Amino acid sequence: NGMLYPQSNDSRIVFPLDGVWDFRTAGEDSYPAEWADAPLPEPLPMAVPGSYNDQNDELNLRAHYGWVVYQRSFAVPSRLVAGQRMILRFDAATHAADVYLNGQLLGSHFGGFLPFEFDVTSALHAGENLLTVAVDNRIGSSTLPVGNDAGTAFMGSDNANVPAVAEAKKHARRQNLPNFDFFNFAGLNRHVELYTTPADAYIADIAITTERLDHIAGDACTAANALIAYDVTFGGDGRQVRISILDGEGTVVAGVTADIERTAKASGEIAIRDAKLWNPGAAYLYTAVAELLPSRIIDAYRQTFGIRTVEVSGTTFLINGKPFYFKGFGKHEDSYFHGRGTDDVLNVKDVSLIHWLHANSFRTSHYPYAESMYDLCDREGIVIIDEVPAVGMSWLQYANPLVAERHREAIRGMIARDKNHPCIVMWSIANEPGLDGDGERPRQAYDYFRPLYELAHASDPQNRPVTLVCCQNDYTTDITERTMDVVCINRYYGWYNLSGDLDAACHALNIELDFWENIGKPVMFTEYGADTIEGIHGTHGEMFSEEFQRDYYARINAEIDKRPWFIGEQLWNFADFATFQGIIRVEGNRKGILTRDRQPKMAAHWLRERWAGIPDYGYK
Amino acid sequence: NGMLYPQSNDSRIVFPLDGVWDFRTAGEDSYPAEWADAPLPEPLPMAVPGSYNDQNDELNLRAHYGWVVYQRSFAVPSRLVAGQRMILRFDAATHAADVYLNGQLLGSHFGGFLPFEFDVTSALHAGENLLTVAVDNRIGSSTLPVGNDAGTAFMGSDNANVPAVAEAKKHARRQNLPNFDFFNFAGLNRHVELYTTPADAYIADIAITTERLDHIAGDACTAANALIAYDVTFGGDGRQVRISILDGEGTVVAGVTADIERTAKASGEIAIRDAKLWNPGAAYLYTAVAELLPSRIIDAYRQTFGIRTVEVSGTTFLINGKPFYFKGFGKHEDSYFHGRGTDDVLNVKDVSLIHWLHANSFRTSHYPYAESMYDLCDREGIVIIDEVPAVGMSWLQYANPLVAERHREAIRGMIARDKNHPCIVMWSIANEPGLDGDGERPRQAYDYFRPLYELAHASDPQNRPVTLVCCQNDYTTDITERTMDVVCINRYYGWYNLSGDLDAACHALNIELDFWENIGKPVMFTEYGADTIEGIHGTHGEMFSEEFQRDYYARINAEIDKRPWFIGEQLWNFADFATFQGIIRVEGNRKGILTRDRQPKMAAHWLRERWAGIPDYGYK
Ligand SMILES: O=C(O)[C@H]1CNC[C@@H](O)[C@@H]1O
Ligand SMILES: O=C(O)[C@H]1CNC[C@@H](O)[C@@H]1O
């Protein structure tokens, strides 16, 4: 279950395998087996990590349907593999992968946004090793995220009653049709690395929780006492682990030696006096150093954490007992050449833009992001809502056992990967599933999602709030969204309805806010916005102008400011991003307040001024 | 019934009333009638001709619903009104107008794109006269062009099932909702002028027809003999009219004196030896001078015309007996500040761009254009399909007698205004009405449109072909389009359906072409295209890129080149133009091959090279 990010220390070394690999496209539903057994014939270069789709302009890899095959060679000194346990980790392969080393199948994985690994201790040999990775991009009614098996991509146009169209559909080239509004970027989107651990006994997992804070300071910077809990899991085979707690300067401030008991596990609690708390806008990180003891150390791992509590109380969202207000947006992992490929230069820039805007938060719309972004937000004081790739779902998916299992895998896998981050304050178990309607449909949706809500709570040792991000719907027949811990709504009054009429949009919004006012839950926007082409201007801004986007937020935000139970504003989107092509997507989704190259539109400046005057705590 | 354009000569003077008028907005359903008795209070300036909507950025006149009121003063010498018949002509007031002169209601008019006039001989007086014109912009289920009484505009977004939206709609500000894809520009869109004729007896109407051509030259530049016919109508009260035919140099080549008989008319035929024929790309104009005789001349009018025949024969469209192929586009009267206002600088530029592109034709989508444009196309050898404002129609309109009468008025009024232009080769009685479906709907549409097809044929002395421009539909249950003289189809395979997939688009197109192959009529595109933002580029062009637009025409045109019965390609659109705001309109409609400022996108250059190689005659 543990998926600790690979670390190098006195006991452990990481050997990255990123770089320019060999690559070939393959078939709609197969690829040649012999490509795992010998060097790829006539290979193309392909950089990893990165989506493959925008890395070759001679081919139209955006249109590719099915498999591709990556390959590279590598060699490491026998000295450093001798006696060690050898693990090959894929941070992400989107969506499914088969992995081979030296002509041997290592195994496969489904799930394009979470890491997986293989023990290669026995498949490795000295000299050059040949690593082959086949990656499948296909999506459909059984995948998360969901594809459409026929018809159109999400918000695509059709003339389905025209006989010629119906007939041409039967013979059209197979293409993935996302039931979600972002491009289906595929390939080795995140890092690949070989790493070592000791073989006889090793640290497999660590969970740190903030159990209780006694007497939090008025400014929330410290607490008189913090009770933290640790849970260390071991692999391999009267043994002990030493746990040292280091503060922000590396000083040892606490330490215990705990007994390992047979899963081999050690768990306990540690009191940290005068603890320095983690807050939005004021991060503070500790390190838990776990050392497996035999003066010598057998194994070690350093786990960053921050001390803070999260609690929903009535219509408030309390961080360290203080009423928080979210300011931010949904993001995407999306950029020009990389596609969905992780890029830490861009992550660093985006975090600085979050600060420039005076925002404090975002959601990982619509899939878990690369692990390095959460470390960055841990150090930079930015709060995250962590979301699984359960986007595009409807009643067709609720009746499918395979989908339900993939959904539980994604929830368990996201929380197992991300549980130690102090920046994560809430889990989202889906984006815009179908919840409303007549007959049994609302109850069917509820019966599908309630066990997943329970699973997210059971899986997280911090027991953080759980939400489900709700599409614009008939809120009077949806019986699911109102049962979440925080109500997170996506609304486009004045854009997809009441188009351009901000008076009517605000009237409609206020009618629905009157509905939520009586529910007793904290409510926030997780999306709202307007497609905007930079450089389109008007004195009376119409849809797609920079002025209309600014006016849109000015009018809507004035209405939610009147509601004390409305605890956050996350807009859509941080920045323009790529989508499947169609008649409503002008080079992708243009609801960004920043352009795809991260330049600010008029509305970004307006928002920056607004958010500069809204405090993280106590706004409401 | 005659609407001869006002002419100045020895018997007649025109006094233009264009300029900067006074203007006020008025109510949704009313205006103060006392404004006609005195100068408007606190007036704004408003230039005439021109739409009013983009002439004031302090007010939001694009949002205006209902009435506005124009006013100006004028004075003419008593010496020149004395004894004369005084006519006040509005070339176009969009959509409906009440006209007052010195407080007296002259009358009212409804069609927004055709001229109307009043006899003001008795309402004029010496010194300053006060002209007040109330103009109504409202559209709805009883107007042509059609508006929607509730819901959304054409291709608008909605979330009708959200209770807050339904409730907000009931209280939203009233707004015109076009059921057509262009902005509802209103006001005194075309010129206003006072003109004089003799009062006792005057020329009221002139119709010139090309009756027969004998021994047409191989190059169609001449015929050994041409038989033309004239029909002159007189108003007022052994009288005679002299008809002189002037060639391009002003030489009188033929001439006849005809007897006037009682409604006062003179008619006959005139033989013209070695007649020089009007052709696309090679215009030649004669002048028919009609002089009412008492040595003196009582009245005179000079009517331009061109000698050519138009005939549909099987699957060919014959001009002067040669098989013509249409190259061109739908247009709009649309430009930045003028709106739908006529602008002769822009007309002159646009005709030069038609030549630059090597096009030979356009359609007056979706309303009759300003009279000056047809005069320009007569002189520049550009063929026109002339279309009435019957756009946005469906079964709701077919049972509405007010609509039917407005539709007949527009057909009669367009042909009465435009019958003498040689450049007009075909009449269009509607754009994209509802024609298909099940039950009685296809027959209901046929029973509505067939009397209008006959009306157009009975109204035109030249008996030119009549069509109806067909929207993308289920061509197998449409029973009306296939009965037109030329089948004119609008198709967006690969844009609004099969989106982005040009292989599937061409397959679907070919399936439909196979259907039309068996119908045995000549067929042409009147629309096809793809929204394109200039400056959006890709190596594999996706929707909205310049490359996709180029590839779209390249692929579609290769398929129609294989069909001998496919006689023309008019694409959509000549240039980007304004629409009601909505989620599929990026600053309007962007299917122009030119930008709104008339600059060429990539596809315009490609089309220019294609069309350079396609002859007007004998391509198929
Ligand atoms: O339509 C939109 O702009 C947004 C609607 N909510 C879901 C987003 O993924 C999508 O991008
Ligand atoms: O959708 C479009 O782009 C066109 C479809 N046919 C009618 C045009 O007025 C309209 O502009």
Numbering used by the authors:
A (entry chain A), B (entry chain D): -1 to 235, 274 to 298, 303 to 334, 342 to 667
Which sentences did the original study use to describe this structure?
However, intestinal bacterial GUSs cleave the attached glucuronic acid for use as a carbon source, allowing potentially toxic compounds to re-enter the enterohepatic circulation. However, microflora-encoding β-glucuronidases (GUSs) are notorious for reversing the glucuronidation to release SN-38 in the intestinal lumen and thus represent the major cause of undesirable effects. GUS contains a deep enzyme active site (the two catalytic glutamates lie ~12 Å below the protein surface). To understand the underlying structural basis, we prepared C6-propyl, -hexyl, and -nonyl UIFGs (2–4, respectively) and resolved the eight X-ray crystal structures of 1–4 bound to EcGUS or Bifidobacterium dentium GUS (BdGUS).
Inhibitor 1 appeared to be potent for both human and bacterial GUSs (e.g., Ki = 180 nM for HsGUS, 16 nM for EcGUS, 7.4 nM for BdGUS, 6.5 nM for CpGUS). Because the resolutions of the four structures for BdGUS (1.7–2.4 Å) were higher than those for EcGUS (2.5–3.2 Å), water molecules could be visualized in the catalytic site. Seven highly coordinated water molecules (I–VII) clustered in the active site of BdGUS/1 and formed an H-bond network with the inhibitor. In contrast, molecules VI–VII were located near the aglycone-binding moiety. Asn636 and Lys638, characterized as a unique conserved N–K motif in loop 833, provided hydrogen bonds (H-bonds) and electrostatic interactions, respectively, with the C5-carboxylate of inhibitors 1–4. The former group (including Arg632, Asp179, and Tyr543) interacted directly with the C5-carboxylate and C4-hydroxyl groups of the inhibitors, whereas the latter (His379, His413, and Asn478) formed water-mediated H-bonds with the C3-OH and Glu574. Additionally, Trp619 provided a hydrophobic contact with one face of the iminocyclitol ring. The potent inhibition of 1 was contributed mainly by enthalpy (ΔH = –10.47 and –9.12 kcal mol−1 for BdGUS and EcGUS, respectively).
